[PDB]
Amino acid sequence: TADELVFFVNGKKVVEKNADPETTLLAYLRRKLGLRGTKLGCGEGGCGACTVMLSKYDRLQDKIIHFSANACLAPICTLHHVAVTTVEGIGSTKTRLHPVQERIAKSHGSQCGFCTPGIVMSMYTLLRNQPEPTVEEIEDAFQGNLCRCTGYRPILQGFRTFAK
Amino acid sequence: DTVGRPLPHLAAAMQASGEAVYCDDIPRYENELFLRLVTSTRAHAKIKSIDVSEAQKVPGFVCFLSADDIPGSNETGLFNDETVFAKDTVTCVGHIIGAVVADTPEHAERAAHVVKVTYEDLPAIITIEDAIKNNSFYGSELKIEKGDLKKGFSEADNVVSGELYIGGQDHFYLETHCTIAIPKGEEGEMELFVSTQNAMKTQSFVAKMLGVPVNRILVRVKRMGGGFGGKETRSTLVSVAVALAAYKTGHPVRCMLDRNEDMLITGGRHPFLARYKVGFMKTGTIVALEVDHYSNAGNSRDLSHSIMERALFHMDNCYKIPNIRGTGRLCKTNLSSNTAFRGFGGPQALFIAENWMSEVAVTCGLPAEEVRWKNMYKEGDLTHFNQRLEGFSVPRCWDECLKSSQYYARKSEVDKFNKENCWKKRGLCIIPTKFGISFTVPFLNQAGALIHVYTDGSVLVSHGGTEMGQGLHTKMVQVASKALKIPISKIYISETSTNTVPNSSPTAASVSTDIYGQAVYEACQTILKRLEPFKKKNPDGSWEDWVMAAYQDRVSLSTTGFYRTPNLGYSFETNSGNAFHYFTYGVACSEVEIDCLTGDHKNLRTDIVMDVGSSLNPAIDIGQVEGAFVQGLGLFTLEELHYSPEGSLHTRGPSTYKIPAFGSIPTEFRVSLLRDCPNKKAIYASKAVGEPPLFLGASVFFAIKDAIRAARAQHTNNNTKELFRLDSPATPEKIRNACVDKFTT
Amino acid sequence: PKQLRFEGERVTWIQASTLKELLDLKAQHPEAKLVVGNTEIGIEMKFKNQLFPMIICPAWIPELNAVEHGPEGISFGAACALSSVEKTLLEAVAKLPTQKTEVFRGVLEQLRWFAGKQVKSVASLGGNIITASPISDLNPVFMASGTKLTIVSRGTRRTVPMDHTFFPSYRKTLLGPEEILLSIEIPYSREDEFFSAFKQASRREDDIAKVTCGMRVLFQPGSMQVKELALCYGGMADRTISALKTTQKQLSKFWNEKLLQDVCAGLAEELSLSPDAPGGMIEFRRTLTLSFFFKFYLTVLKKLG
């Protein structure tokens, strides 16, 4: 009666045999897959704590496209044949940090740390599309990401390092 | 020795990789259930019936819980004036009536929505104005008075009088309230994982609720994704309900609030109303001041009394006022009980002070910097509460900020922009602050630590303070590393827990570094003294060899450390005794451009000079200054909570409540820490930094007022010495309407 | 690429692979909700406790994703993400004379501080349009510009410029039960045609009382004499409305201080708010309607200098 949902998370095949249409990707990542890096901060698309990168072959444009999305509003049933990247998909203190992770950490851009994965994924996405962005492109990537702790200055300053 | 070095936050790398564990990231037990609060939709009403029929049809529904389920006691809250679960009557929208427990959080959400309550509405009191009209107050009038008021006013060249309102603020910690409760099944024992700044009250309120000794309850706090005062007491609303569910079911139970529940239920900063009368000389010299403060406390006392006390202690800001009377009252209303929010009543009182100070300057037709400077305290001066200002560094901060911000040159250029532009105006203001350091309740100024050295020489530090992003654990590691004379890599802090350090004060009042720093230091000293003989026996040996020798000689490598802040004890009866240990000082200068036609504005530049003594960690301390400043900029310029007339909150998420974004911060944002200003009163000459910078946010508000003043001087009745009321927050609505023109008319 | 069916506790979701499936499904289930970005529906289900037991996701259908550059304008499939619309329009703006991109520029101004990248990469054009929030930032621009909507059901097809009649009442649009929105042609601007858009930058209520507008003026060839004038506002009623009465009066008047105060007089009466109007901020909102027009007035003169 019911079809299989197949997607990928951090390079790994996820085969959901009983997808519920109501299930969000945030719920799936956190509570089925056990990938708790992606956070719930509002559930209404306004804070970006739940930011992940989505990737797919665009039949029209021909290429693979990469973009950021709020996992709190993404129904898993929209993700058939899509590839999800989370904060744990890009680097780890157990293996090696991604440069985006190192620089936000070392630049004092993370205080309580709850917005950090979301902002990391916003910057990371930007770099997957534009490896040499401008300062303006950098500020722009974060219009969907809130931080209550840092006053934002350190985050931009650490990421400015990626421009020119 | 890293003390004074910009060591990054110890957890930042793991925070960036998503490896740092927050409460809801803890894995679930196989049998773990989920709780969701069932809450009042009425501001004031009798509960007639509760019908759970529909909830019971939801897949995975376990139970509904209410006041009848509680084994111990339904009375809770700091002053024992709250219910855990409301019984006959609700007293605010958001008031907790019960909880559903289900097998998934989605099922608990669904079941909670379908719980049907029947009410009979009773008449409600929502506004401060309503509360005053009904004499609906908690306790009696608070008052600080000094000098002769009916002498000062008799003598004053002029007076200014008026009324000012400042709206509240939601904490908007990125991680909302969260508790996991694990029932052990033996002797009422329960272990709780909680996003709270107050593991002591959590522990005590759970035990009281359950009817069980406090020694049965273990509360553990790894870290919070922000607290800001909001998890200092209101975290128990979730914790106690979760404990009850664990007790009833015998299963582990968790709850993390959705943002909308959190905004409605858990309280925010206190809104303040002030009526004031200031008397002054033609010179701008203040001769008398009378201020009556009113806070909107909501539907319980909570911390409201202490928040008003702090307001009263800061109604002077940095100004000497020979004759002064301040009063505070706490308005009892049908709103969620309001609570601690970074600043704890200080920013409200300081804002009231800068508001009339700004009106004094306009009335006398003098430059604002000149009137502020000429009224400033001097070294050795006493405050209105009769405490001496020792090491009063505002004059240095002021002078250095003026110089480095190029204030006088840019003030010229602001004036040129204003004469050359019709429908956009620039403003520029420079504001000081002082903020007193200590809990104003003397008994909270105590701190414990517990340190173990294991036989490999690694050190485990435990102290009563919690980490919420402010880098307290980092600072304690730098302290211990310096005190033990070993590198930071040998030392670890895992968590805060009631079984390692009991009876801890909430992590609050900006004093945590000072008091836990001292506790940690004393414990380290004890360790060094015990190790000293072994050092002498093996002088060219290593830390590890000394520890192992001490171990084998049966010398204990475990110790407590304790600090009690000396010489605190202010009396409202005698208007004497120190209320604070010392003060933290700062000055900010901010420039804005407003759009006269839309009420929008751009923050152009801000320069801050902050006295934090000799910083333990300049990077953390600057980070604290910038964070606090931006929270203050949000309080005064962006964030607005809005209620229906029936008292129900409209603004319940980031789409209707705007905290500062990446684009809200000043384009040029400079922060310097005052150099060569050691503080004899705290650990390693440092000073508390967490809360004192927030009010500097007001510099953006007074820059806005300055720009509105120019817009009015262009388009309305032209009196240079014309005053108008601008409440906080200065939103686009208020800014626009105040730019009276051919369109507003 | 084939049709997928997913079944949960309360909801059936069908991922439609072709236009025919979509139209067939929408005929069979007239009430079905079409989800693309889910940035509206996910909110209605979580926060308004709405239940929609039948969902059709058309995001895969090539026709709902097509970007087409024609003689009259640029046509976007209804499922095109707002970031795609933005990128296509930013590309057209950099390539075409300024006089052909006045509307594109307005759309781009509304898109600027409109959420963040995450929402804009998944929010559809058709989604913002059919949702029909009183405070939609795009509907007033589309209305003011007469952006053309291709609406399709099983068998039948039509193309209507968006006008005031398209939003009859609260959160309703003029599509029949079996119909879907297929594509949206955003027009190039004409010689002597100028366009602005503005929006309020706070807001405290869920989907009311945030002033947002599209403004369009078409002058007689080489004149300052009004031939067509359109002023559409969101945040002023239960729906996107046009100040028809006010603008009708300006037809064949000249663009002068007289035009200004008359429009500001017309706006004040036509769009007047009762003191009990949902969302409050009555004085502010009124003032913005005139202040926005005044900005448009001034910008139109500079664009004529």
Ligand SMILES: Cc1cc2nc3c(=O)[nH]c(=O)nc-3n(C[C@H](O)[C@H](O)[C@H](O)COP(=O)(O)OP(=O)(O)OC[C@H]3O[C@@H](n4cnc5c(N)ncnc54)[C@H](O)[C@@H]3O)c2cc1C
């Ligand atoms: C945090 C955030 C910020 C936002 N800010 C703004 C803003 O500033 N200005 C603004 O205007 N909006 C704003 N929005 C709304 C956003 O623009 C809309 O939510 C989005 O365009 C809806 O598109 P969707 O694909 O996500 O719709 P969905 O949620 O998937 O569907 C929305 C509605 O459109 C219908 N629909 C979709 N496609 C068709 C079709 N082709 N034919 C017929 N009906 C169809 C659906 O049935 C449903 O009723 C914001 C939303 C979020 C979450």
Ligand SMILES: Nc1nc2c(c(=O)[nH]1)N[C@H]1C(S)=C(S)[C@@H](COP(=O)(O)O)O[C@H]1N2
């Ligand atoms: N990142 C961050 N900084 C913060 C807070 C927070 O929750 N997160 N709370 C503030 C408040 S309300 C206080 S009282 C102090 C408490 O910490 P301290 O005493 O260790 O400075 O930190 C402040 N700075």
Ligand SMILES: O=c1c(O)c(-c2ccc(O)c(O)c2)oc2cc(O)cc(O)c12
């Ligand atoms: O955070 C604070 C707090 O909790 C309390 C308090 C008061 C009475 C109690 O019974 C209690 O448990 C706490 O006082 C304070 C006093 C301050 O000057 C500053 C603070 O930040 C607090």
Ligand code: MOS
């Ligand atoms: O004293 Mo901070 O928790 S308000």
Ligand code: FES
């Ligand atoms: S949780 Fe806030 S945007 Fe997804």
Ligand code: FES
């Ligand atoms: S570091 Fe705390 S919210 Fe960003």
